[PDB]
Design a binder for these strands. Sequence first.
RNA 1: UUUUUUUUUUUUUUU
Lengths: 95, 97, 144, 181, 143
Amino acid sequence: PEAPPLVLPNWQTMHPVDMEAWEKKQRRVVRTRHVKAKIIRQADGRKLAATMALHGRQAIHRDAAVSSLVSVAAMCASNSQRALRGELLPETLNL
Amino acid sequence: PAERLHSLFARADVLAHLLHSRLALPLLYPLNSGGALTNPLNSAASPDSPAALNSIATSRWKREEVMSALATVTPLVLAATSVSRFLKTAHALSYFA
Amino acid sequence: AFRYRREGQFTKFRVHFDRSGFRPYIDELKWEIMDWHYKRAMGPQMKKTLMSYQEGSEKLQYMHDLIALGTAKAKFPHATKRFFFVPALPVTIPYRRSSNPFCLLSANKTGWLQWSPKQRVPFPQPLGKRKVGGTDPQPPVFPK
Amino acid sequence: ALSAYSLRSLIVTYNSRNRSSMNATIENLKNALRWTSPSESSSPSSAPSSAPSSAPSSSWSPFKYKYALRHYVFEDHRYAFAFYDVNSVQEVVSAALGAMAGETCCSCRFSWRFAGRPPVSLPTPPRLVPSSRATVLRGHCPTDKEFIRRALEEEQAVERIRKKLDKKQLQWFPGKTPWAP
Amino acid sequence: RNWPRLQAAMPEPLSELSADSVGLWLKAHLERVIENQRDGRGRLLAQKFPLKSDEEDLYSLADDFIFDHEIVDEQFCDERLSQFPIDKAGELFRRVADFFGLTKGPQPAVNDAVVAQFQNLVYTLDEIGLSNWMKMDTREIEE
RNA sequence: UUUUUUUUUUUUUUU
């Protein structure tokens, strides 16, 4: 779904015909043109993830333990965060 | 209290509060500005021949009307002091930090 | 910002006459203003002629019914009233035969409508001391 | 097929030249309801259409250098109503036209719908065993909300298409084209 | 003199406290309201009807629970004087009735059709003039 | 929105 709210009027809450006098019976402006602001998604943690990916690249030519090297492959094998922006995925995998 | 709340407290109260028929009408329904005019029929009200067709008794027989109006003004205060007041409590508490 | 107070501003100065929802009004008033004078001049005159001959007025109507339908359907004895003549005038406004079942004139099968002998609420109500034009048959006079 | 049609919606609009005349129509329409055979009467929705106005200008007494002006305002009123699932045509069309009073015209807009192939499938489901190896308010429309959403979207689509096409075929001196002669 | 009587028809979390515990919070709450009462003039002197004979007044009934903080909501006033929202009558009733009845206490465990019927009572009272009582305190009708 | 954009604002309207 893409339309949760379904606002429908009724007979008991209908605006009167003479709407000119209705505005004069209020303390301040209430009704206004249709202006609603949407929510824009930020990096959602992807900005920090990119920095962490570079750390695994440096920890390959250090002759470390096999257990520690498994983490590098998992990051390089991502499918929804890293994408293919930069041409570093094949280079890191080859090394 | 399960069989006396589902359709007894939120439904029966509406029937008692449905007094718009007697409230919307004017206080003096059987008497108007033209009450002493020629409105009564001369051929059926002057000689007093009929007994049920016509009855000119709305000028001093206010005892029945007085009692009827008295019973309709007491319930009105209860609705404003029980229903309107109860609603205000929720509205005020809806913005308590 | 006043929204309701400024309603209709767009369709007042930035809209064409042929590109708006506003309908003309001169067309209706053309046939309405003229008919008012017809009922005023011919109104009292028609009633005066009808009341000129009080008795023997129903004889002409009774004889006419014997030629159109032959048999008098509305025949009544001498001890009963026949009918009451009502002064009516013809219709001059070329109204369209609309299909509205709730209309008051769409179901008119005759070219005559009743005329009110007395009116308490004059339609042409003036906004001041000015009188209605064409309501002074007698010419004026000056002190000289 | 003609017999397969059904009145999907009926948009009823009003155009009154006076404030009092428009108010009388609303009361008359409401009185006609709450009297039909079905338990819940048809309750159409409200949709005001603003209030257009017009006021020409003229110079003002003759033999003047245009020092003063006199305006003549001509206001107007409008009202629109929506209908959904009009099962009874006689109890709706007659009520709308019978609520008029004075110089208050109307403009209806019918909307029919034709059904295609009736979906008839999914017979009695198969079965086996292991081998062992109400809620109706007072002043509210009785129709379902899902039906209104499906029909409402269609109306918004036709309005956009009509405005786009109408703007294209709108030029001064109709029938004139460039370098045609 | 009132805590013991209200220990039955109340939520479990709000029933373990003693009488003394409630008094500590209540004592400090009243002082804050009076101090703050010294766009707030439209609901303090305009609605209250002086009599000179009433030695005391009620609390937390119609308009006593407001002005708890230094500043109050701006849109709250618009919904009491200009126009009270009657469409949300059913929504508020269901959101308050559930507090007393959690479907596991003294109250029954079945309550669904009450909200649907309660809405009708509000609409019927609207014709009598229920909307007018929201703006003006229910004091003139009583006297 | 770290595989997202690539940008000035009007005189009726999301009832």
